[PDB]
Design a binder for this molecule. Structure first.
Ligand SMILES: CCCCCCCCCCCCCCCCCC(=O)OC[C@H](COP(=O)([O-])OCC(O)COP(=O)([O-])OC[C@@H](COC(=O)CCCCCCCCCCCCCCCCC)OC(=O)CCCCCCCCCCCCCCCCC)OC(=O)CCCCCCCCCCCCCCCCC
Ligand SMILES: CCCCCCCCCCCCCCCCCC(=O)OC[C@H](COP(=O)([O-])OCC(O)COP(=O)([O-])OC[C@@H](COC(=O)CCCCCCCCCCCCCCCCC)OC(=O)CCCCCCCCCCCCCCCCC)OC(=O)CCCCCCCCCCCCCCCCC
Ligand SMILES: CCCCCCCCCCCCCCCCCC(=O)OC[C@H](COP(=O)([O-])OCC[N+](C)(C)C)OC(=O)CCCCCCCCCCCCCCCCC
Ligand SMILES: CCCCCCCCCCCCCCCCCC(=O)OC[C@H](COP(=O)([O-])OCC[N+](C)(C)C)OC(=O)CCCCCCCCCCCCCCCCC
Ligand SMILES: CCCCCCCCCCCCCCCCCC(=O)OC[C@H](COP(=O)([O-])OCC[N+](C)(C)C)OC(=O)CCCCCCCCCCCCCCCCC
Ligand SMILES: CCCCCCCCCCCCCCCCCC(=O)OC[C@H](COP(=O)([O-])OCC[N+](C)(C)C)OC(=O)CCCCCCCCCCCCCCCCC
Ligand SMILES: CCCCCCCCCCCCCCCCCC(=O)OC[C@H](COP(=O)([O-])OCC[N+](C)(C)C)OC(=O)CCCCCCCCCCCCCCCCC
Ligand SMILES: COC1=C(OC)C(=O)C(C/C=C(\C)CC/C=C(\C)CC/C=C(/C)CC/C=C(\C)CC/C=C(/C)CC/C=C(\C)CC/C=C(\C)CCC=C(C)C)=C(C)C1=O
Ligand code: HEM
Ligand code: HEM
Ligand code: FES
Lengths: 460, 426, 171, 32, 245, 58
């Protein structure tokens, strides 16, 4: 009004203004006249439906008024061939770039002004575009999530992605991050195919990530039968179903056309020994674990919780000083799995780093004490429930549970962890140890290590 | 032009603004601010001379009447003329104080070369402009100055084929000569501003208020922290000058040096040659001409003074050999039994006493040279002032000879003490 | 391009390739408080990180666009709704009870911060940011920052929006 | 489409004709 | 006051006029980086001015900031006053100065002029028309159409002496400066012949290309038309004082 | 959500900057009035307030 205009022209407070009173109200007492409503939490209900095409929809009902979360999960790095290795990384580096309905700048502005967040994360055999925002901004945000998650890559997007992928590769090489070491581990484990393709993609194929290759990748892999849409905090399932239908209904059914299909993954017991002249030696010893289908997966997680929390610290890090750091790796895949240890320590005692490490893993095969098992299970429960308490992570794991087991199992994770016993963990680890080892070593004196046959004999 | 590698600074408006907005100046005293005073006096000279140019008609027969009439009918014109004259005086004072200060600090090192020479060139140009300005007065002083300059110019050509005509037409002040010299004066006066800017940019490379290397790393931001101090020091020096002029020059005076400016070219034909005297800043050169009655030797003395003033860093500098240069010595060779001598190293300023003694002898000789007119009517029939000859010869020796600057005695004595102490303590 | 967004600080930071991290900290205590910016970046941009956060806040003393107000408002709403982990919410409740003897509900905070306007923002900024004193620390390579490493004219005039921003835009 | 931009275009086209009209009127008046 | 402060500062223990530490002082920041270690034995500081140079006003520091700003303002105001004097000098040099107004007073006797006659006189080196209008002529001029008139701002000044009003106007055509016809049968006024500009008997612009009336001549009539003082209109010119005293 | 065009943001920012800079117009006006005051006096009492017509009898 005129009074506000006058009091803004001269930067002087308007004492009588109600907004001034509200903003300058003493924090010790509530603002006069305002008293928000009170409400109690409600049990969460999960509902799953399928469209005429293969797209699936999952909703977690509102438990308490909060920001709505949405997401799209694509079963589509395992589905990358040497022709199009690293496409998913380029998509990640330019996940906000769309040109069909909304622009890169405009959808970034949508993210910024909605006050929420929008992220894209991809693993082997999965990509996930998640977003969280206020309810009244949900619709628009979803229009961005779907397009960014389903629109074919544009030439400008691919051009930007090539540069960003090159920068990412340079940064990874400069930092010597454990991700590159894991890439080498998977290369030797599976053999540059299926799960063996590097997560960040081959560096020699970066220049080939043109819009044509990305579009070929999307056409081959992205199909309605492998698209899951998820919402969390939605009062009505049907409202979100309609919201999705308004966007993903156009996608034609892929039935009747030869599908790409995923080749069954084979495990290879290779070894890699790289001389890097590093003052520290990094070793990794892995074996084939069980897939998601097998019930032993939980046990394996407990085994990891038995190492990364209680054992591996005391037996290796505390007793020996040359152990820079040791950890237990546990990856699960739809058709295979990996479980083992990754250690790093002084190069001059590389052999001492290896033997002891094996013993620790072998100790698990020997048996587990009751107290250690209880501690590991308690720590695993704490971590899992800390993850589940946050709505976004809960929704992501809900999507993954639906896409893997066709039902929701995160509601009874605690019971599954409780059901685990020491005997099951010991037997599972003993069975895993019998598999052909996959051994990787990068260090200054990796040239002097026990032979692969000696490694197997020690493991035996 | 592959020999020319480039320029230290690109004097573009963007880069100049950035450089002067990010400039830093170390803490200093008034003695190291004569350059700013010179530049500010140059700026005021530019402004006042531009104001004067709109009043001065370059015809010789109208300049006196025009000046007299336009001081009354127009307000502030005589104020600008007085400001111009006093600005010339203060510009000479500040420039010579700056020269003495920079000679004192032994700025003949190689790292000072670009700083030094760029300055001297400016000074040299600053001389020429002043000369042209004198000619514009169209008095008997201007007549004598023009005649002397024309004779000096004609000296190089052995008085053959009127090579001076393109500027000093007939060696007299007329319409053509006045017009040409006035336009050249204006153009070179404005060129002095750019020369000063270049010199100021160059000299900041290694700027020091004192020879001693203070370890301070923090510095003042130029725009206001240093600029305010520079303006205040200018104010203080101007107050001191006002006091000195007020007391030393009574309101009415008898036998001033301006009395030779009574005669106006054209109006008065006869010239009172008994009392011929230029302004005090050109007094030393007229005194040198009177002391040295030989024309060629006097011209050579002037040229040598200016050019040796230009080439100080080369004769007295390190020369990039790191003091391994070998001098030529007349008598010290017999004492040391060596044909040449390595240049001495320890030539500090504040500590050593020989440097201060020689520098102050040189400065006092310069002051004595400017102190008075030799009065050539009988300056040679009467055995001339021996002090003037001594001061001139010491000026010549100090500028050019490296035995009065960077002397070998200090280095030899210090090495003798070093050897004795090391022998005693092993 | 950095300009094509609704954040001025991010607009400035996008043009600085080597300035890697920036975070704004508000630390309130019983008697006093500290509100400021922490930058971590290459020393070549030392004079930018030094003079950046000072300028932007001071600019808000005179003019703040409605886009920034609404961006901050939506961010605050999302932050209020996003505190869902038991440990963090318990810690916040305990701290609020300690320093206020009261638990401030989400609705009350939303009402208080939504009522802010351009004029109120400008007045608060001039009360707390315009032409005010500063506490500055620079840890790391100071070869280019050693000169002018004192509380000179530039430091005092940096808290003026558009006045004293000379040193930020150079380099 | 904006009102003031459309008006600006109209006046740009019309002002020369308005000046021509003024010139013609001045000629008529000067004729007597 | 000043004396009290001088007395307080008189009893100060300092080394040869400098307030410096009499003993080595070492200060270590407790929150320094872990890699710095202990302070070296080098004595970096000779003075404790970091603490001595303090007016302990951490409360109300803005007051001292304002005081420093005020001192800076006073200094800048003095400098700007000097700069303003310089600028006055420059602009006054560019814009001339009319020290005094040259005399233009004159007298011409119009009584001899018969009524209804126009005479040309040389005043200020320019022609000027002097005319006498009878009552019938004035009445005829009035009531005429105002459409022909092309000067709303211009007026007419008529003298009152000699039993007949006397008018004095500038005899220069407004169009280009040519001398107009003195008398015409249709209207005994002025009508320029070089381009046909038509004026009336009052010198107004009636149906003529010229857009301005004949400029008026400042005059005052005394002695009943015998003494017509004629002095050019005087306009202000400042500064007018040439001598302070 | 509030998604103004960058045209509008630029226009509003420049409007504020113009408002800020217009405040110095009065300052320079006062500086040029204190300076050159005789010129202002001549202008006021020559164009806006023309002198009186009549002349003294003498
Ligand atoms: C036909 C008509 C044609 C048109 C005619 C009209 C022409 C109009 C021209 C307009 C020019 C605009 C210039 C903009 C910048 C001005 C400064 C500024 O930012 O103001 C904000 C400033 C805000 O106040 P503040 O917060 O106190 O800050 C004061 C500081 O100045 C705040 O400064 P700071 O400390 O923050 O930092 C200062 C500086 C850091 O310090 C520096 O680095 C200084 C500069 C270094 C290099 C130059 C050295 C020389 C210094 C500059 C020249 C000064 C003398 C000029 C003499 C001119 C001839 C007489 O940093 C910078 O700002 C960097 C940029 C500096 C300006 C240059 C770039 C922008 C302008 C030019 C762009 C285009 C290129 C130029 C050529 C264009 C050709 C078309 O405003 C003022 O204070 C204004 C005060 C005015 C009143 C006092 C003086 C009055 C005069 C008294 C004498 C008597 C006359 C009275 C007046 C009569 C009527 C006029
Ligand atoms: C219409 C305008 C209205 C507005 C107000 C106008 C008045 C404003 C006065 C402001 C103060 C002016 C004088 C002090 C300037 C410094 C200010 C300052 O820093 O204060 C803050 C601060 C004091 O803190 P504060 O208490 O918050 O401030 C109180 C105010 O400053 C106030 O302090 P206070 O009240 O205590 O001031 C007393 C002072 C001012 O009171 C007045 O305002 C009255 C002035 C009346 C003058 C009348 C003259 C004749 C015309 C009138 C004739 C007709 C009437 C006759 C009536 C007859 C009745 C019987 O009265 C005196 O005259 C007594 C001063 C002591 C006698 C000194 C004799 C001269 C010695 C000169 C030596 C120079 C040597 C240099 C060379 C050295 C090397 C060889 O100063 C310091 O801390 C500085 C301490 C360190 C430096 C000490 C230096 C001492 C020796 C030099 C003294 C230089 C000044 C001499 C002035 C003589 C009279 C003109
Ligand atoms: C080839 C050679 C070419 C020439 C090159 C030579 C080098 C030239 C270098 C020039 C340097 C100029 C620097 C000038 C710096 C100073 C400027 C200045 O002040 O203005 C010029 C000033 C002002 O000149 P002025 O002309 O305005 O006024 C002086 C008037 N006369 C000349 C009559 C004296 O020039 C001087 O006069 C300076 C020297 C004056 C020294 C007087 C000191 C007091 C003497 C007292 C005597 C003893 C009495 C008591 C005896 C009993 C007790 C012991
Ligand atoms: C370093 C600078 C000089 C040393 C002292 C430090 C001065 C700066 C500190 C702040 C001072 C602020 C107040 C100053 C007030 C002065 C008022 C005054 O006297 O003028 C009133 C008068 C006001 O005049 P008026 O309007 O009353 O009347 C003019 C008409 N007559 C002449 C008939 C009286 O100022 C002027 O009109 C003078 C304009 C001059 C323009 C051209 C410059 C000529 C040189 C002037 C200065 C001469 C002194 C030496 C300068 C040396 C450096 C160049
Ligand atoms: C080139 C960039 C600027 C350079 C600055 C240096 C000075 C430049 C002066 C020449 C250019 C002037 C352009 C504008 C023309 C109008 C001038 C004027 O004041 O009018 C005189 C005119 C003429 O003055 P007058 O009428 O008294 O004198 C002429 C008539 N006689 C000779 C008979 C006395 O006066 C006016 O009518 C002005 C009244 C209004 C006063 C306010 C004017 C504000 C706008 C101009 C401000 C200029 C400030 C410059 C400051 C510079 C500081 C270094
Ligand atoms: C006809 C004139 C010809 C002679 C030239 C006249 C030059 C006069 C210069 C002095 C007066 C300047 C007054 C405005 C100053 C604005 C400063 C500024 O930065 O702006 C603030 C802000 C910008 O703030 P800022 O802080 O970003 O300023 C920097 C601006 N740049 C980047 C351009 C250097 O701009 C505005 O919103 C106001 C702009 C005002 C000027 C607009 C000019 C164009 C529209 C009006 C004129 C149109 C007709 C032109 C003639 C055509 C004839 C056919
Ligand atoms: C006939 C003469 C009449 C003279 C009358 C004079 C009366 C003056 C009365 C003044 C009362 C006080 C007003 C205070 C306003 C403060 C505004 C403000 O907040 O400013 C901050 C802003 C800029 O703010 P900022 O960004 O600088 O800093 C804000 C400060 N903080 C951050 C702490 C809040 O400035 C302005 O608003 C300036 C623009 C408004 C004023 C413009 C006036 C233009 C007039 C031009 C001259 C006209 C002369 C006549 C011409 C006639 C032609 C025929
Ligand atoms: C060997 O011989 C030689 C010489 O002599 C020895 C030489 O001097 C030279 C060099 C010298 C020359 C060639 C002569 C040059 C002379 C010079 C530079 C002396 C003048 C110096 C100055 C600084 C003059 C400054 C002048 C002023 C400030 C006057 C200001 C006047 C005005 C009108 C400014 C306002 C107007 C404008 C900017 C024009 C813009 C347009 C308008 C206003 C339009 C107006 C009209 C309408 C309709 C709107 C040489 C090369 C040489 O060889
Ligand atoms: C550093 C710059 C300048 C210097 C050192 C200088 C030097 C001089 C000198 C020494 C005089 C004679 C003074 C005397 O004999 O008392 C003079 C006069 C003169 N100068 Fe300059 N000048 C400079 C700049 C200018 C400029 C830029 C102009 C014109 C744009 C100019 C125009 C004049 C005029 C017209 C005269 C004679 C005035 C008269 O006789 O009334 N000057 N100058
Ligand atoms: C009109 C002539 C001159 C102008 C305008 C001028 C300008 C300046 C300025 C502004 C400075 C910086 C302030 C200072 O150091 O005091 C400076 C420094 C300097 N000037 Fe000049 N100067 C002139 C003449 C000279 C002369 C004649 C010399 C030597 C013969 C010279 C050599 C130097 C040097 C070496 C420095 C740097 C001093 C250092 O590094 O400590 N200049 N000059
Ligand atoms: S000359 Fe009088 S009208 Fe053309």
């Amino acid at each position: 009004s005129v009074r506000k205009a006058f009091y803004d022209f001269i930067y002087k407070d308007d004492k009588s203004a109600e907004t001034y009173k509200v903003t300058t109200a003493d924090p010790r007492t509530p603002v006069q006249g305002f008293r928000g409503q009170t409400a109690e939490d409600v049990a969460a209900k999960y509902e799953v439906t399928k469209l005429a095409n293969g797209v699936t929809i999952i909703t977690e009902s509102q438990t308490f008024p909060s920001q709505v979360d949405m997401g799209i999960l694509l079963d589509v790095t395992r589905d990358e061939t040497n022709e199009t290795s690293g496409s998913l990384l380029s998509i990640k580096n330019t996940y906000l770039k769309t040109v069909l309905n909304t622009n890169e700048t405009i959808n970034y502005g949508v993210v910024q002004q909605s006050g929420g967040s929008f992220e894209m994360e991809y693993d082997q055999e999965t990509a996930y575009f998640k977003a969280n925002c206020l309810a009244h901004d949900a619709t628009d945000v979803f229009s961005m999530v779907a397009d960014c998650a389903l629109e074919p890559r544009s030439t400008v997007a691919a051009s930007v992605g090539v540069e960003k992928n090159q920068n990412t590769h340079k940064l990874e090489s400069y930092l010597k991050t454990g991700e590159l070491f894991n890439e080498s581990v998977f290369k030797t484990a599976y053999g540059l195919k299926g799960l063996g393709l590097p997560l960040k993609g081959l560096r020699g194929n970066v220049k080939n990530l043109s819009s044509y290759t990305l579009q070929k990748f999307q056409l081959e892999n992205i199909t309605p039968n492998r698209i899951f849409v998820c919402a969390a905090g939605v009062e009505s399932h049907q409202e979100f179903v309609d919201l999705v239908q308004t966007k993903l209904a156009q996608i034609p059914s892929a039935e009747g056309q030869k599908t790409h299909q995923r080749e069954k993954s084979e495990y290879l017991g290779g070894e890699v020994r790289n001389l890097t002249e590093e003052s520290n030696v990094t070793l990794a010893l892995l074996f084939q674990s069980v897939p998601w289908s097998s019930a032993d997966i939980v046990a394996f997680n407990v085994a990891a919780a038995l190492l990364n929390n209680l054992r591996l610290k005391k037996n290796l890090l505390q007793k020996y000083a040359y152990f820079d750091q040791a950890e237990a790796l546990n990856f699960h895949f739809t058709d295979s799995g990996l479980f083992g240890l990754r250690t790093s320590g002084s190069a001059d005692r590389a052999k001492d780093i290896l033997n002891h490490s094996i013993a620790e893993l072998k100790a698990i095969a020997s048996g587990v004490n009751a107290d250690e098992l209880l501690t590991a299970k308690a720590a695993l429960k704490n971590s899992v429930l800390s993850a589940l308490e946050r709505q976004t992570d809960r929704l992501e794991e809900t999507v993954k549970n639906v896409r893997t087991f066709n039902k929701i199992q995160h509601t009874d994770y605690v019971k599954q962890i409780d059901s685990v016993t020491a005997d099951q963990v010991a037997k599972a680890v003993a069975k895993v140890l019998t598999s052909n080892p996959t051994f990787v070593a990068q260090g200054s004196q990796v040239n002097a290590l026990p032979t692969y046959d000696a490694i197997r004999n020690l493991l035996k | 032009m592959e020999w020319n590698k480039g320029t230290y600074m690109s004097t573009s408006i963007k880069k100049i603004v950035q450089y002067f907005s990010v400039m830093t100046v170390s803490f200093h005293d008034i003695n190291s601010l004569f350059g700013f005073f010179t530049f500010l006096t140059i700026a005021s000279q530019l402004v006042s001379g531009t104001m004067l140019a709109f009043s001065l008609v370059p015809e010789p027969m109208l300049i006196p009447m025009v000046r007299e009439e336009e001081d009354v009918e127009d307000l502030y014109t005589d104020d600008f003329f007085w400001l111009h004259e006093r600005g010339v005086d203060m510009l000479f004072i500040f420039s010579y104080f700056h020269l003495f200060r920079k000679i004192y600090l032994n700025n003949f090192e190689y790292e000072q070369e670009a700083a030094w020479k760029s300055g001297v060139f400016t000074f040299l140009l600053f001389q020429v402009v002043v000369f042209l300005g004198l000619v514009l007065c169209c008095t008997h002083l201007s007549d004598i100055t023009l005649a002397i300059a024309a004779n000096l110019y004609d000296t190089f050509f052995a008085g053959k084929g009127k090579f001076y005509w393109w500027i000093f037409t007939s060696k007299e002040l007329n319409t053509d000569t006045i017009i040409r010299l006035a336009y050249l004066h204006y153009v070179l006066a404005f060129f002095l501003a750019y020369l000063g800017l270049i010199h100021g940019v160059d000299m900041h490379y290694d700027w020091k208020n004192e020879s001693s290397m203070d370890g301070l790393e923090t510095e003042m931001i130029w725009f206001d922290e240093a600029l305010s101090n520079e303006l205040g020091a200018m104010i203080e020096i101007i107050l001191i000058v006002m006091i000195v002029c007020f007391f030393m020059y009574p309101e009415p005076e008898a036998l001033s040096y301006e009395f030779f400016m009574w005669g106006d070219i054209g109006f008065i034909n006869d010239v009172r040659f008994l009392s011929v005297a230029p302004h005090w800043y050109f007094r030393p050169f007229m005194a040198w001409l009177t002391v040295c009655p030989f024309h060629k030797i006097g011209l050579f003395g002037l040229i040598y003074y200016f050019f040796i003033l230009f080439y100080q860093p080369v004769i007295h500098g390190t020369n990039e050999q790191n003091n391994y240069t070998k001098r030529n010595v007349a008598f010290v060779s017999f004492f040391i039994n060596r044909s040449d001598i390595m240049t001495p190293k320890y030539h500090s300023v504040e500590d050593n006493l020989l440097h201060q003694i020689t520098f102050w002898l040189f400065l006092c000789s310069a002051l004595y040279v400017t102190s008075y007119l030799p009065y050539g009517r009988f300056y040679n029939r009467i055995n001339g002032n021996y002090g003037t000859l001594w001061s001139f010869m010491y000026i010549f020796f100090y500028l050019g000879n490296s035995f009065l600057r960077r002397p070998l005695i200090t280095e030899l004595y210090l090495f003798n003490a070093f050897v004795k102490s090391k022998f005693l303590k092993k | 391009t950095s300009d094509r967004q609704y954040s001025l600080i991010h607009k400035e930071l996008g043009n600085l390739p080597d300035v890697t991290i920036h975070k704004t900290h508000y630390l309130p205590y019983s008697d006093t408080g500290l509100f400021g910016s922490y930058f971590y970046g290459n020393e070549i941009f030392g004079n930018q990180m030094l003079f950046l956060s000072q300028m932007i806040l001071s600019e808000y003393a005179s003019y703040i666009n409605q886009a920034e107000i609404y961006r901050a408002r939506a961010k605050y709403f999302n932050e209020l709704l996003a505190e869902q982990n038991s440990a963090d919410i318990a810690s916040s409740i305990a701290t609020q009870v300690t320093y206020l003897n009261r638990r401030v509900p989400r609705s009350e905070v939303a009402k208080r911060i939504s009522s802010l306007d351009s004029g109120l923002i400008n007045r608060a900024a001039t009360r707390w940011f315009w032409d005010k004193e500063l506490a500055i620390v620079t840890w790391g390579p100071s070869h280019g920052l050693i000169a002018g490493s004192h509380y000179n004219r530039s430091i005092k005039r940096s808290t003026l929006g558009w006045y004293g921003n000379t040193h930020y835009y150079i380099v | 489409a904006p009102v003031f931009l459309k008006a600006l275009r109209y006046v740009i086209y019309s002002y020369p004709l308005y000046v021509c009209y003024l010139i013609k009127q001045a000629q008529i008046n000067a004729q007597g | 006051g000043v004396l009290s402060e001088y007395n307080q500062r008189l009893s100060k223990k300092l080394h040869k006029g400098h307030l410096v530490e009499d003993k080595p002082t070492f200060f270590v920041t407790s929150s320094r980086p872990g890699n710095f270690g202990d302070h070296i034995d080098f004595k970096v500081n000779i003075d404790n001015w970091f603490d001595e140079n303090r007016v302990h006003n951490e409360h109300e520091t803005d007051i001292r900031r304002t005081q420093i700003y005020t001192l800076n303002a006073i200094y800048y105001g003095g400098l700007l006053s000097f700069a303003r004097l310089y600028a006055m000098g420059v602009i006054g040099r560019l814009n001339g100065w009319k020290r005094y107004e040259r005399d233009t007073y004159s007298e011409v006797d119009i009584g001899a002029l018969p009524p209804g006659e126009v005479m040309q006189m040389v005043w200020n080196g320019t022609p000027i028309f002097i005319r006498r209008l009878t009552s019938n002529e004035v009445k005829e001029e009035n009531e005429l159409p105002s459409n022909t008139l092309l000067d709303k701002d211009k007026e007419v000044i008529l003298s009152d002496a000699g039993n007949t009003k006397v008018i004095v106007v500038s005899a220069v055509c407004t169009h280009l400066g040519c001398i107009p016809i003195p008398y015409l049968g249709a209207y005994k006024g002025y009508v320029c012949i070089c381009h046909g500009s038509v004026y009336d008997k009052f010198a107004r612009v009636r149906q003529g290309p010229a857009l301005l009336n004949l400029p008026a001549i400042n005059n005052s009539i005394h002695d009943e038309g015998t003494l017509v003082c004629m002095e050019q209109l005087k306009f202000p010119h400042e500064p007018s004082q040439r001598f302070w005293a | 959500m509030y998604l103004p065009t960058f045209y509008k943001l630029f226009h509003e920012t420049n409007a504020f900057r113009l408002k800020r800079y217009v405040g110095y117009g009065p300052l320079l006006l006062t500086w040029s009035i204190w300076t050159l005051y005789p010129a202002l006096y001549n202008m006021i009492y020559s164009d806006f307030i023309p002198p009186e017509r009549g002349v003294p009898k003498r």
